[PDB]
């Protein structure tokens, strides 16, 4: 029931009715959440009276002592959440003028006093929410000049009145929010009277096209920059909807979840500069060629799930006329995730210039094959990143990417691709760095496959079922700057020695879950297959779960830089001696769930020089002194981290020591 002291005081879930009085004086932070308090023991706090932080959570207090604030004048922040008080006097706040932040959550304050906040001026943020009110009155005269953030969510204000807001004339609110407060009418001139309002947030308030157009008129010639409005049942718009808004300078907008239906032509012609624009979770069936006329200054557009769901019975066919984007001359980021566009036309993206990033994941209901001119419309823009996952593509023809010159990232994974790479499909690419092709059906490799892309740096082929991979000229040969390669889960059978030759910049390799056990077995005709030579840069190597049972000593001859190596899930029992000698700097190892019985220092001679982590959790140990002695002694005398050392490391071979913790000799 003690409280830990780390320059802060934690009192949570102690369900104690009285504050602790044993707290050291020099601490300045107290936490009283998940506890019940009745009244203010100014005495207990006066013991320290140096706290600058103070929070009481889920606590119901009927009243507050006016004298504690002079008792503790060093306080800066206060949180009152789920507090039973609903009518407070300025008398309590006579000496509380040194606060900077005040939270009043879940208090059900039906009515405000006359001037309860006149005394204080130094606070910055004051949020009141989950309270029942009907007026914006908070003070008889103008005061509270130094407040920036005011929150009035979850309240019952009905109509804005200019006389209500006259107090903040001397100040300028940075961002006000009135969400979840059903409002119907606006007094003319109310926004002008209060002063400059940079950011206005209204959400989940029913307005409708008629009332919103009235609102747009009220906001003319006001110092607003961020207008957010959501869940307002804005089905459709006309040009007159935002006519009055053209007399200001906005920079951001929000129309999410408004279930918008149709936009008329030139509806957004009143907004010259609008840096950001969100448009998602709405139901549009048809986009007109001039519906987007007027947007010169736009940098970031979002269209995720902003179109009608396809339905054959409905035959909705959400369709876009081409040349509809020819007005966004400054766009740099576009999104079209999770729509049902039927296909790509020949002039869909005509006009875009500063485009740099385009995502089309799960966008088209039916895109079966890529043609000569499927991307002809995108000729004239410097596109860097393209995204084409989850589109059930089925086959790619040659000369498909000729248009994209500056492209450097291509993602085609998670599709339905089976064909033979003739090598002509990468024809136009010039500066690509990475290509993803994981999670597809099958590819057929040839010698003349990747010769057209010598600048590649990343290649992911995970669960792809490669065919004809063991050709005499290695199909990976033309690549030379490659650093990362993945071939996991493909269940590969055989490999030639020279499949990795002429590659020196390889950093990571990964071959887990493949079937390569046969090759390394000594009885193999032609001897063991050495596919690892000349790799003078390897850092991480993974060979989990291949079925190995025998390791020739001559495999890690060239591995001068190995840092992490994994060999779990195999069937290793007795690795040969003096195999890890060349490994100068090894910082990890993994041999879990193998069939190793005994540990000897000759094999683990240079391996155990300095390790950061080790893992040999499950093995059938023979805990007898002939070999296990080195391990038991070394474990006691070494500081290399071995998690779960006590429990999982067990032996059973000595019948007497069957199921015995090897930790205790």
């Amino acid at each position, epitope marked *: 029931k003690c409280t830990v002291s780390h320059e802060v005081a934690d009192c949570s879930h102690l369900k104690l009715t009285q504050v602790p009085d044993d707290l050291p004086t020099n601490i300045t932070v107290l936490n009283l959440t998940h506890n019940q308090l009745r009244r203010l023991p100014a005495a207990n706090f006066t013991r320290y009276s140096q706290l600058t932080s103070l929070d009481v959570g889920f606590n119901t207090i009927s009243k507050l002592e006016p004298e504690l604030c002079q008792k503790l004048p060093m306080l800066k922040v206060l949180n009152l959440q789920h507090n039973e008080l609903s009518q407070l006097s300025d008398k309590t706040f006579a000496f509380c003028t040194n606060l900077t932040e005040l939270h009043l959550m879940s208090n059900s304050i039906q009515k405000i006093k006359n001037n309860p906040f006149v005394k204080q001026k130094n606070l910055i943020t004051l949020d009141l929410s989950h309270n029942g009110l009907s007026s914006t009155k908070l003070g008889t005269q103008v005061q509270l000049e130094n407040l920036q953030e005011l929150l009035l969510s979850n309240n019952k204000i009905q109509a804005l009145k200019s006389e209500e807001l006259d107090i903040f004339a001397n100040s300028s609110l940075k961002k006000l929010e009135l969400s979840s407060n059903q409002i119907k009418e606006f007094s003319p001139g109310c926004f002008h009277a209060i002063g400059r309002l940079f950011g206005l947030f209204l959400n989940n308030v029913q307005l409708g096209p008629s009332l919103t157009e009235k609102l747009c008129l009220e906001l003319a010639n006001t110092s607003i920059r961020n207008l957010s409005l959501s869940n307002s049942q804005l089905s459709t718009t006309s040009n007159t909807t935002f006519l009055g808004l053209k007399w200001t300078n906005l920079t951001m907008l929000d129309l999410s979840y408004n279930n918008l239906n149709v936009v008329g032509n030139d509806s957004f012609a009143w907004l010259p500069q609008l840096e950001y624009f969100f448009l998602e979770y709405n139901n549009i069936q048809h986009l007109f060629s001039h519906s987007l006329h007027g947007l010169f200054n736009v940098r970031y557009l979002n269209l995720k799930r902003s179109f009608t769901k396809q339905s054959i019975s409905l035959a909705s066919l959400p369709k876009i006329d081409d040349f509809s984007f020819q007005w966004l001359k400054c766009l740099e980021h576009l999104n079209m995730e999770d729509n049902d566009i039927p296909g790509i036309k020949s002039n869909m993206f005509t006009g875009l210039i500063n485009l740099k990033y385009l995502s089309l994941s799960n966008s088209f209901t039916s895109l079966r094959t890529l043609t000569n001119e499927t991307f002809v419309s995108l000729a004239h823009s410097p596109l860097h990143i393209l995204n084409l996952t989850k589109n059930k593509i089925s086959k790619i023809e040659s000369d498909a990417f000729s248009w994209l010159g500056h492209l450097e990232v291509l993602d085609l994974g998670l599709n*339905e691709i089976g064909q033979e790479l003739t090598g002509q499909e990468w024809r136009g690419l010039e500066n690509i760095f990475e290509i993803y092709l994981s999670y597809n*059906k099958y590819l057929q490799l040839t010698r003349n496959s990747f010769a057209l892309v010598p600048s590649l740096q990343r290649l992911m082929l995970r669960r792809v079922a490669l065919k004809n991979v063991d050709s005499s000229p290695s199909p990976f040969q033309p690549l030379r700057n490659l650093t990362i390669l993945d071939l996991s889960n493909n269940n590969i*059978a055989n490999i030639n020695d020279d499949m990795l030759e002429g590659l020196e910049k390889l950093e990571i390799l990964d071959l887990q879950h493949n079937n390569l056990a046969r090759l390394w077995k000594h009885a193999n005709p032609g001897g063991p297959i050495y596919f690892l030579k000349g790799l003078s840069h390897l850092h991480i190597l993974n060979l989990e779960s291949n*079925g190995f049972d025998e390791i020739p000593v001559e495999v890690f001859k060239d591995l001068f830089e190995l840092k992490i190596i994994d060999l779990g899930l195999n069937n290793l029992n007795t690795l040969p001696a003096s195999v890890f000698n060349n490994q100068v700097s090894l910082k990890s190892l993994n041999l879990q769930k193998n069939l190793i019985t005994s540990v000897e220092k000759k094999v683990f001679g240079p391996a155990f020089r300095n390790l950061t982590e080790l893992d040999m959790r499950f093995n059938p140990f023979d805990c007898t002194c002939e070999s296990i002695a080195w391990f038991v002694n070394w474990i006691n005398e070494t500081h290399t981290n071995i998690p779960e050392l006590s429990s999982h490391y067990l032996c059973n071979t000595p019948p007497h020591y069957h199921g015995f913790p090897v930790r205790l000799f």
Partner: nanobody
Amino acid sequence: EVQLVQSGAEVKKPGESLKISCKGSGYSFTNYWVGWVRQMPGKGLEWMGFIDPSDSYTNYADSVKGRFTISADKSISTAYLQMNCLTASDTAMYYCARELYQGYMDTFDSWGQGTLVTVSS
């Protein structure tokens, strides 16, 4: 409408040869892989391998390799499984199944009738 028909059951003493033929019709047969599954009596199922009739590329599970082979002929629309050393404890039901395959969101299997092989001591 797709159909798969196999040969009838039979019993052999420890011996060196057996061939089971799987015949299917109603579709191209040159665009879909064919796989083989074995169920021991009153036990779970096991996988062996699959073949692509287009160019006879084959992939096996580790265990069955070295004692089984898989081959097929386009002209007759048939696939063959062969045993090289029949022995005891290999008595089980055998199936051939077509597989409508891609990366995700498809119908991964559609089976056939099944054949029975018993190895009497």
